[PDB]
Amino acid sequence: LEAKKEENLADWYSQVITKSEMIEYHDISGCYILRPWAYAIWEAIKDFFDAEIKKLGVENCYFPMFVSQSALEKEKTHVADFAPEVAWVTRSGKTELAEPIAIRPTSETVMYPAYAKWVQSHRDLPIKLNQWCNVVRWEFKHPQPFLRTREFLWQEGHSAFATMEEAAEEVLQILDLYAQVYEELLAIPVVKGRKTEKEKFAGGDYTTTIEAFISASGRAIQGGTSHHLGQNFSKMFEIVFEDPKIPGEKQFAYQNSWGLTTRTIGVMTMVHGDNMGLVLPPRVACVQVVIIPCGITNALSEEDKEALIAKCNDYRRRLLSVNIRVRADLRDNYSPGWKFNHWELKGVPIRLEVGPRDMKSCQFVAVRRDTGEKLTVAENEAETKLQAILEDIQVTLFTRASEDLKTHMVVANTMEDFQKILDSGKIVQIPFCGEIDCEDWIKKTTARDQSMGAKSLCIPFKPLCELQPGAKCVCGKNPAKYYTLFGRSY
Amino acid sequence: LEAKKEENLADWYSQVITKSEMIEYHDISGCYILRPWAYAIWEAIKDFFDAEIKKLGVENCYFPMFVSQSALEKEKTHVADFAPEVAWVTRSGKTELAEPIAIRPTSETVMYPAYAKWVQSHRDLPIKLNQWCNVVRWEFKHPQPFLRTREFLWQEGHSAFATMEEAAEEVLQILDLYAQVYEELLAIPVVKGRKTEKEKFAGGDYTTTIEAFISASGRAIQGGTSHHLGQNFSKMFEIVFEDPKIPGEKQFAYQNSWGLTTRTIGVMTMVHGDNMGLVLPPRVACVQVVIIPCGITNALSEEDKEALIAKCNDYRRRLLSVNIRVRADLRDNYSPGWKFNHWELKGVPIRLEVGPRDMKSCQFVAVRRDTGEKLTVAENEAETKLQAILEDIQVTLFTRASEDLKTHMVVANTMEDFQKILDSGKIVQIPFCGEIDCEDWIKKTTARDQSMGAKSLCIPFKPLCELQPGAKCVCGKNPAKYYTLFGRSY
Ligand SMILES: O=C(C[C@H]1NCCC[C@@H]1O)Cn1cnc2cc(Br)c(Cl)cc2c1=O
Ligand SMILES: O=C(C[C@H]1NCCC[C@@H]1O)Cn1cnc2cc(Br)c(Cl)cc2c1=O
Ligand SMILES: [Zn+2]
Ligand SMILES: [Zn+2]
């Protein structure tokens, strides 16, 4: 690794993700190749989430990606600001086509006409459906492998209830899951809260979100979102049912929608990385432990060279049997020292080092990726001790970026504190009125002193300080409705 | 179900797949919605396969879907017959675009430039990679939900070895897996063999395949394919490595590729269906057993109506604990008799019927979907007996369509037998020379008497009869190289 996090972050990231065999650039910019080392992290997230939404009664499915012109345009889901970012299909070979078709940037326009058809009785509710798919949005903005890409993978859930007490409960349930993905797997602490009326999903009553901080840049980033849509789309798409014991009457259904994307892997990179390379949390690594045989020489007995290469498999065998994801790298051509480095770039949590010097002592050595600390372990304790080190790494990585968050997230009550602490490369809870103006304003004000300015992130469900009796927005005109998280974003 | 399999098959299928809540048509023909009842079958296939290729050392990944014009066209992967079936992206919103981009119809053109880059040393081999993704091919041919669709889901593996003994072994390993999917899960017997030089994947040395018979129509269908590519693509894309102990020399890598698609679900439907509806093999059903409470009346004691609805959960609880996938349908608004029918269309293998008459006798009743046979079972035997019935159904469905295959697959040595037995709505092993002509010919000959004519299916690895000393192609000119499976196809 030539570049350094503190110094040229933009380069560091692009070097870490290539040299860890995670990403590979494609002959079309904005598009990237998810190599196995990264995909296994996505698949790890996928396994957890999938397991939890199904406990909630959600079922997976697959809708088409092609949304016809008379669909987006036929309605006004959009919110048509994004309309110049949709790609279009126009010709089948050379032969032109009847109407052009769009590539899904999201799936409301494809799914909701159908929801309308399936909801006949009130009996056909709820309808909770999820899909794991790719989506395509267009961007000329200088692209970036996990955070700013043209095609990406995600998950999008769309549920639809009779009542609102229902819909409401799910929205918060899902956001907790999205938290668990970041806090329990990825070991990334996040801030839960509600979008401002400026920022919330348009065409949807409210919008809960999960925001994480990437100190390295002093910006914060959006993790995943969970929206309550109320009746907006049902009205739009006539998803209606005859009421319960309010006969002859027409009730609109209450809807939700929530998504999480592959930016997770980018955030995970940005947060836990070294100048030594990528670092993975034990919960998501393809390989929790790598077993490398070291201490091999040109004239090492040939019957010894197969005691080593066999001792290694005993660890491999024993660890696999306690569901530790272990590879033994028994490759003849690379050095040991080469391997040490290779698996360090990739960020494998523990390196299990096996030398004959240690074999003699019926023992072995384990190296933590995060701290670098070596430990010498008895062969009869490989399971308990290594499982423990895996748990202790997860904690460390989490109880680091969280202390790193607490330093970098503070309250400021004047506007003059807020421009100092923001330029201090941090993020701030301020008193805020809520009006779009004293936000729409705030951006321009902060941008004049900073190459851009503070955005609202979320309105913390649990803000740092409680608000005091008379208290005013940073503007100085209106009173403060709620402490509100602001910062420069991604 | 109004239509009937024997009578209007084209309608039967379209009714079965809608009324079993599997498929839902979209505002663009050729495109369909995979509802949960179907997707869970795809996901079941996915779970099995994924588990097996990983034992083989394959790793999953995700390449982009956008293949640039200077890629397909830059090379000649194609085999350009299919070129007028590729969709194209041309505008980002209204703004036109630099060059147009294609939607992946397959991924050789996207993956192989990269394979070239990753294979530097000979050390970087093998490279076995898989991806589960959607692909888009265009068709005006009257579409059909699982068998003839424009967008579909599949899996595509692309491996790349130094030697050919390697590549060769995998091709056959994979085809056995594809067999297992059809024979062990889907309970559909298939015929293993090699494509003819007419039919094989172009741009690839040979092509093993799996062919299944859909009696209902007298046609056969392609299950999945596994190709050996040898050196064609490496040469094309310069995937090269310095040789082992043949220094200073340039070796091309040997490649494979293999795919399986969502047509599986269509074949599964076509093969096992009733006029009573879809039928699922226990190995893939979202719901192996449905628990329905029956024998409820208007004036049934309220404390009895909760002994029933509780007895049901005891079965639910006990079955879930032996990994039987069970739903208890406790819905208050539908009749019992309505439920019986609903879950019959969906093809749930067993209906677990709970009535108080049986509760009195501390017992219950189970109905097989395939045969219709009812059985009365002790409450202390619910696990062993139901698991057994699930196993016995799988077998039945398999040892049915297999006897149905043996009737409908026969040998014919003259050409005059072959035109009779083919028009008998069956498929035939004939003596065949191999020349494209005496195949290219065979189609036109059979088409003049039949609304189209026999195609080669495969060249059985284990043909019905052995060939006799002097023996000639059905044409009568050349000698027969091998018994070869022919028939009308899909
Ligand atoms: O992504 C969304 C809408 C919903 N999609 C499913 C997950 C929950 C989420 O609120 C917001 N969004 C974001 N970007 C977009 C870009 C384009 Br282009 C279009 Cl057409 C539409 C959108 C767009 O609708
Ligand atoms: O699907 C293939 C090529 C390979 N894809 C991966 C699985 C193994 C398989 O042999 C054959 N095929 C089939 N249909 C096609 C349609 C179009 Br359009 C194009 Cl460009 C290309 C193709 C095309 O290459
Ligand atoms: Zn204000
Ligand atoms: Zn011939």
What is the distance between the alpha carbons of residues A312 and A299, in angstroms, rounded to a whole number?
20
3-state SS, residue B135: strand
DSSP for residue B126: -
Contact (CB, 8 A) for B278 and B17: yes
Which two tokens mark A12?
């560091």
What is the distance between the alpha carbons of residues A313 and B459, in angstroms, rounded to a whole number?
43
What is the distance between the alpha carbons of residues A107 and A64, in angstroms, rounded to a whole number?
9
Angle at alpha carbon of residue A191, lines to A57 and A483, rounded to 5°: 120
Residue B479 phi/psi, 5-degree rounding, is -80, 160
B199 close to ligand 2 (CB < 6 Angstrom): no
B108 assigned ligand-binding residue: yes
CA–CA distance from A77 to each of A89, A158, A235 (Å)?
20, 14, 11
Q: Is A327 on the interface with B (CB under 8 A)?
A: no
Smallest CA-to-CA distance from A33 within B245, B117, B377, B102 is with B117
Ligand 1 atom at shortest distance from the alpha carbon of A137: 18
CA–CA distance from A427 to each of A7, A454, B116, B126, B148 (Å)?
21, 9, 45, 48, 54
Contact (CB, 8 A) for A461 and A417: no
B137 close to ligand 2 (CB < 6 Angstrom): yes
What is the distance between the alpha carbons of residues B140 and B150, in angstroms, rounded to a whole number?
9
Distance A439 CA to ligand 3 centre (A): 7
Contact (CB, 8 A) for A376 and A364: yes
A201 close to ligand 1 (CB < 6 Angstrom): yes
Smallest CA-to-CA distance from B255 within B193, B162, B176, B175 is with B162
Smallest CA-to-CA distance from B123 within A335, A19, A310, A32 is with A335
3-state SS, residue B71: helix
- Which of A25, A27, A32, A159 would you mutate first to test chain B, the one with the most B CBs within 10 A? A27
Determine the residue of A104, A106, A228, A229 to mutate for testing ligand 1's pocket, defined as the one with the most ligand atoms within 8 A of the Cβ atom.
A106
E strand or H helix at A59: strand A59-60
Taking the CA of residue A39 and the nearest CA in chain B, the distance in Å comes to 6
What is the distance between the alpha carbons of residues B423 and B174, in angstroms, rounded to a whole number?
34
Q: Is B32 on the interface with A (CB under 8 A)?
A: yes
Contact (CB, 8 A) for A356 and A291: no
CA–CA distance from B167 to each of A184, B160, B451 (Å)?
41, 7, 40
Give the number of whichever ligand sits closest to the CA of residue A71: 1
What is the distance between the alpha carbons of residues A161 and A181, in angstroms, rounded to a whole number?
26
What is the distance between the alpha carbons of residues B161 and B228, in angstroms, rounded to a whole number?
11
Q: Which of A42, A92, A150 sits opposite B87 (nearest CB)?
A: A92
Beta strand segments in B199-349, E: 206-214, 219-230, 240-242, 250-252, 254-261, 289-293, 326-328
Which two tokens mark B485?
């499976």
Residue with tokens 């993956």: B111
DSSP string of B170-200, one letter each residue: HHHHHHHHHHHIIIIIS---EEEEE--TTTS
Residue type (1 letter), B175: L
Taking the CA of residue A314 and the nearest CA in chain B, the distance in Å comes to 19
- What is the bridge-based pairing of β-strands A88-92 and A59-60? unpaired
What is the distance between the alpha carbons of residues B75 and B81, in angstroms, rounded to a whole number?
14
Q: What is the CA radius of gyration of chain B?
A: 26
Q: What is the CA radius of gyration of chain A?
A: 26
Smallest CA-to-CA distance from A287 within A1, A20, A5 is with A20
What is the distance between the alpha carbons of residues B195 and B213, in angstroms, rounded to a whole number?
16
Residue A476 zone, left/alpha/beta (φ > 0; ψ -120 to 50; rest): left
A473 assigned ligand-binding residue: yes
- Helix A36-55 / helix A263-272 crossing angle, nearest 10 deg: 120
CB contact under 8 A, B133 and A134: yes
Beta bridge partners of A485: A429
What is the distance between the alpha carbons of residues A271 and A186, in angstroms, rounded to a whole number?
10
Contact (CB, 8 A) for A251 and A162: yes
Length, in residues, of chain B: 490
- What is the bridge-based pairing of β-strands B59-60 and B127-136? parallel
What is the distance between the alpha carbons of residues A230 and A322, in angstroms, rounded to a whole number?
46
Q: Name the residues around ion ligand 3, CB cutoff 5 A.
A: A 433, 438, 473, 475, 478
Taking the CA of residue B56 and the nearest CA in chain A, the distance in Å comes to 15
What is the distance between the alpha carbons of residues B226 and B176, in angstroms, rounded to a whole number?
10
Residue nearest atom 24 of ligand 1, based on CA coordinates: A106
Beta strand segments in A294-358, E: 326-328, 350-354
What is the distance between the alpha carbons of residues B36 and A61, in angstroms, rounded to a whole number?
5
Cβ within 8 Å of residue B399, ≥6 positions away: none
Residue B78 with chain A: CB contacts under 8 Å: none
DSSP string of B391-459, one letter each residue: HHHHHHHHHHHTHHHHHTEEE--SHHHHHHHHHTT-EEEEEE---SHHHHHHHHHHHTT-----EE--E
Q: What share of chain A is helix, strand, coil (3-state, %, to 5)?
A: 35, 25, 35
Residue with tokens 């999960």: A210
What is the distance between the alpha carbons of residues A250 and A435, in angstroms, rounded to a whole number?
35
DSSP for residue B80: G
End-to-end CA distance of chain B: 25
Residue type (1 letter), A189: P
Residue A406 phi/psi, 5-degree rounding, is -70, -35
Q: Is A197 on the interface with B (CB under 8 A)?
A: no
Half-sphere exposure (Cβ direction) of A46: Cα atoms closer than 13 Å:
16
Residue with tokens 């593996």: B157
Contact (CB, 8 A) for A225 and A207: yes
A263 assigned ligand-binding residue: yes
Residue B68 with chain A: CB contacts under 8 Å: 27-28
3-state SS, residue B296: coil
B196-202: long-range contacts at Cβ-Cβ below 8 A with a sequence spacing of 24 or more? B196/B432, B196/B434, B196/B436, B196/B439, B196/B456, B196/B459, B196/B484, B197/B434, B197/B436, B198/B436, B198/B439, B198/B440, B198/B456, B199/B455, B199/B456, B200/B227, B201/B225, B201/B227, B201/B229, B202/B79
Resolution for this PDB entry, in angstroms: 2.6
Distance B105 CA to ligand 2 centre (A): 6
Residue type (1 letter), B451: S
Q: Is A25 on the interface with B (CB under 8 A)?
A: no
Residue nearest atom 23 of ligand 1, based on CA coordinates: A106
Which two tokens mark B362?
């501390």
Q: Which of B34, B59, B88 sits opposite A62 (nearest CB)?
A: B34
What is the distance between the alpha carbons of residues B243 and A64, in angstroms, rounded to a whole number?
46
What is the distance between the alpha carbons of residues A315 and A378, in angstroms, rounded to a whole number?
11
B257 close to ligand 2 (CB < 6 Angstrom): yes
Ligand 1 atom at shortest distance from the alpha carbon of A72: 20
A344 close to ligand 1 (CB < 6 Angstrom): no
What is the distance between the alpha carbons of residues B426 and B238, in angstroms, rounded to a whole number?
45
Distance of CA B279 to the CA centre of its chain: 16
CB contact under 8 A, B27 and A71: yes
Determine the residue of B58, B63, B106 to mutate for testing ligand 2's pocket, defined as the one with the most ligand atoms within 8 A of the Cβ atom.
B106
What is the distance between the alpha carbons of residues A401 and B26, in angstroms, rounded to a whole number?
46
Ordered domains of chain A (ranges, CATH): 1-281 (3.30.930.10), 282-391 (3.40.50.800), 409-489 (3.30.110.30)
Distance A271 CA to ligand 1 centre (A): 26
What is the distance between the alpha carbons of residues A330 and A326, in angstroms, rounded to a whole number?
12
Residue with tokens 């040979």: B206
Residue type (1 letter), A23: I
What is the distance between the alpha carbons of residues A81 and A79, in angstroms, rounded to a whole number?
6
Determination technique used = X-ray
End-to-end CA distance of chain A: 25
Question: How many other β-carbons are positioned within 10 Å of the β-carbon of residue B172?
Answer: 13
B180 assigned ligand-binding residue: no
Cβ within 8 Å of residue A225, ≥6 positions away: A178, A195, A201, A207, A208, A209, A210, A258, A259
- Alpha-carbon dihedral of residues A355, A359, A360, A362, nearest 10 degrees? 140
Ligand 2 atom at shortest distance from the alpha carbon of B158: 6
A458 assigned ligand-binding residue: no
Residue type (1 letter), A386: L
Q: Which of A33, A95, A100 sits opposite B63 (nearest CB)?
A: A33
Contact (CB, 8 A) for B61 and B131: yes
Q: Which residue of B has its CA nearest to A149?
A: B64
A311 close to ligand 1 (CB < 6 Angstrom): no
CB contact under 8 A, B36 and A333: no
Q: Which residue of A has its CA nearest to B112?
A: A26
Taking the CA of residue A341 and the nearest CA in chain B, the distance in Å comes to 17
DSSP string of A372-434, one letter each residue: --EEEEEGGGHHHHHHHHHHHHHHHHHHHHTHHHHHTEEE--SHHHHHHHHHTT-EEEEEE--
Sign of the CA dihedral running A15, A18, A21, A22: positive
Q: Which of A33, A59, A64 sits opposite B26 (nearest CB)?
A: A64
| Sheet strands side by side (includes A66-68) | A66-68, A95-103, A88-92, B88-92, B95-103, B66-68
Contact (CB, 8 A) for A390 and A374: no
